[PDB]
């Protein structure tokens, strides 16, 4: 539909072009795939960090302790 352009170092363009031709795909497709992978990494890291920070917050601990009462439901 619409395409744009990103500036890279020529060495990095060569390495990405390798990776694209290794997988049998276009460079555009490769960068789409790798963008989604980076998104997933950032998302899960955001969750991990948020949860560890929330262990200090006792309102969170109370909340999950209350929700843990359901642990045995339907069994």
């Amino acid at each position: 539909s619409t395409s744009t352009t990103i500036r890279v170092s020529t060495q990095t363009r060569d390495r990405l072009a390798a990776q694209a031709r290794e997988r049998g795909i276009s460079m555009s497709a490769l960068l789409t795939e790798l963008a989604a992978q980076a998104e997933r990494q950032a998302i899960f890291r955001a969750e991990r960090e948020a949860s560890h920070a929330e262990t200090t917050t006792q309102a969170v601990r109370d909340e999950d302790r209350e929700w843990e009462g359901t642990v045995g439901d339907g069994l």
Binding site: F44, R45, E47, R48, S51, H52, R61
Partner: peptide
């Protein structure tokens, strides 16, 4: 998924 795990006990 395993990317959620941080090795602590209270995590879901």
């Amino acid at each position: 998924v395993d990317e959620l795990l941080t090795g602590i006990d209270d995590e879901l």
